[model samples]
Target: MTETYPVVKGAEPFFFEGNDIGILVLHGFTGSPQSMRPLGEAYHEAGYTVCGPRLKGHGTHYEDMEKTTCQDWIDSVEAGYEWLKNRCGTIFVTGLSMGGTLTLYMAEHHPEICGIAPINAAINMPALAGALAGVGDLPRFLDAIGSDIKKPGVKELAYEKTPAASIRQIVQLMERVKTDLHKITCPAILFCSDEDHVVPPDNAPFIYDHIASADKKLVRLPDSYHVATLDNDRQKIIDTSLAFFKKHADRH
Candidate 1:
């Protein structure tokens, strides 16, 4: 895993009886470390250590993001995962949006993680990606002439032209991970909004159905958008997710 610098130094790892149970939280694309702070506080208050690393190309210039790829993100997750593992008896991970996809990827590859929670992850990137993939005139014209494309929430921060190569790479990674879901063996809790306008709500079920975890669940919030972690159902997300993690992370 490449060593991506963390934006915020997180809490000290938690240990009990000389052992620990670690909890790692991840935020979505184009989002800041602040996005998941509330959940982290709750987990830490619950007597578990928590870390939320800012992914490469996030909370900074989008051009800086142009140089990073899926592996860079995976490396960031691994760095946090290994750090938590050293001081913990059990490790669990949770993330919102693309962060959710990374959590699943890590869980699929790392069996040592006791459980995982993925909220609003995109196994599918709506239909826009496929429709635009081979459109030579559209992307090139936009990039060459410099059309303005703003980041999702912060209009002050505009995205420099999306390098098509990165989009293509994400496509491949999603496909690769989807094929690997059946191999995941840890318990999991999945959360998705029934009304998400970004990624389809069906994605959560799609992933849950295929994952090898027999002790997995799906929670569908009828009143949330893509960012359920910060929306009306945020506390519900907290209570449900924490309960799930506590059940698996604690043998008792």
Candidate 2:
């Protein structure tokens, strides 16, 4: 770990203990619980248990993110999952960006997940980065991936600056995740932003094609960007995912 700034006010981790229906909400790379908190709120309001854990090095400083590795992020969510696991009998997983990658990773490791909903899951990190659509154009480092939000002025709850080292960690994580997609057999819903400039549009279909889940859906966020959870289609994601969770819940 590295030196970290005090957590941003709204960026702190959140846990809402509601019904036995548990939802593990994971934030994106460079993003804090702030980014996923709205969805958590929705789940909580609907009388479901919700935990949105802030991944290591996130919600602090971009430099702290550079010091952390993908494994640290994995450990963060794994801990959150375990906490939710202890309290709820029925569990569903969901995340944004790199967090979505962890959603798949967790589902692969824990077959107990009733379902998963991954929004703008970053599976081809190295491929989509730089030049918007070019690989060779990448510089040695990057200042930030910025907000990437289409809804002007609506900022993301994330570090404005993103370290190349952090991006590298996710690229590696993606390599491992995509290779083992077949291991995730739980019911799933993948939310993709068709206009996303950060994650390649093809990534969603690729994941949908690979994951072993016979029960899976691919939904397009036609009006939002990469951080669609906070964008125009936010409610759609919350409502649809809630229904998805209810549909597959072990015991309603």
Candidate 3:
């Protein structure tokens, strides 16, 4: 018998062709391309090519996600980055949550990127320590960390269950990226939601204080929560990202 899992709606990947400038948008852990679709569309409308690739094992089933590692996720991101690099003159990247974490990782290693804007980046949260130390010996998964929005009726369309092995990979990724944040000298706009219940708010300033970028700015989203991409300040993120990319588009 063929094994099966429920297919998630709106979890499909999307791409738009536009200018020599490309913007790669990435979603969070257990999140599908759906989370970044709106922003990707907005960037495309502004005449920039945009692509949101579904992370390996994500946008599928939880069991599938548990089987993948951080390297798998990074491979997916690198494919998108490579795609844009070959087609565009300059490339900018942005992501939400763990996607933001990967964005930082990319900016650090891929200096050719023009700029980055990470929203609710999961750099170093107090809650992550427990997962790093304890979750490895436990079951294959843990409690869900998705749909953490403060908006009354909005949904993040993320997985309802969290994978422990994947969590370990996430922690490992964070630890690795933390050591080299100063290598990311590209312009960046880090967004922090003041009232986030998922990632600790301090992560924003922590990143701001560490990165080597001379043109970095931290914007606080007071009215939104962790998944600020779909929250009250969604437009602010969209607008600020476009303008920031434009200002730095011509920079070497």
Candidate 4:
């Protein structure tokens, strides 16, 4: 991994033990754990075990990211879940953007996952589709999709260039996840920003309509952009997520 970005200051993976309800927080594609740290801290302070894993090849530089595949990112979260599983009685998975997509994929694959909260999950992106169609033959990186927050002076600490290979892997991962949405029967709460410039807000409803969860809700954040975790409605996310997990904490 290039030391160029070096995972951003304070964006390293975090683990804080608390109660039996463990929370696994994942960041976006190209974003570091810094994007999810504040929310992880909130969960920790509220007496839940909290973890935010740095996805493989992320938190460093795009040069290293280009070498990683989607399976590597999935394995990163799987390892985080395993670590939390050893310590906690029940685990709730949550993430932003691509992390949100992974969170849904986890719920689909792992029957042990108790609940989920995916914020700004990217199951579909027209921009990405167009880009992929145009550059399907290229073996180079493209412009970055990080820091889409509407708030001023806040950065998501993402890659300066998006690796084409990685984006292709992500598209493939999304395809698989979409087909398996029926496997996600856990309690779920999804967050979508009304004005997101990156992942379309429609992705949230598409996920909500397809997932097999009996108890699911979608909350719209009118003031935030794609990075809702750090945007204007961030407090709403932190508060409601705590409540959502608490509501499903005692699942037998």
What's the TM-score of each model vs. the native?
0.81, 0.92, 0.94, 0.94
Clashes of each: 2, 0, 0, 0
Alpha-carbon runs more than 4 Å astray in model 3:
1-7, 250-252
- Taking the tens digit of each residue's C-alpha lDDT, what string does model 3 give over 174-202? 88888889999999999999998888878
RMSD in angstroms, candidate 4? 2.0
Model 3 vs. true fold: TM? 0.94
Tell me how far the alpha carbon of residue 175 in candidate 4 is from the true structure, in angstroms, after superposition: 0.7
Candidate 1 per-residue lDDT, tens place, 1-252, comes to 232443333312222222377788887654545667777778888888777777766555445555668787777678878778777868888998877988888888888888988888778774646645564544531242221112234221223455454565566567777888898889988998878877776789899999988898898867677767766677888899889977876663
Predicted structure 2: lDDT: 0.87
- Model 1, position 210, has a per-residue lDDT of 91
How much is the lDDT of residue 239 in candidate 2?
A: 92
TM-score of 1: 0.81
Candidates in order have lDDT scores of 0.70, 0.87, 0.87, 0.89
Residues 138-236, candidate 2: write the lDDT tens digits: 553566756888888897777756675666678778889989999989998999998988888888999999999989999989899999988999999
Candidate 1 residue 46 Cα shift, in angstroms, is 1.1
Candidate 4 segments whose C-alpha is farther than 4 A from its true place: 1-8, 136-139, 250-252
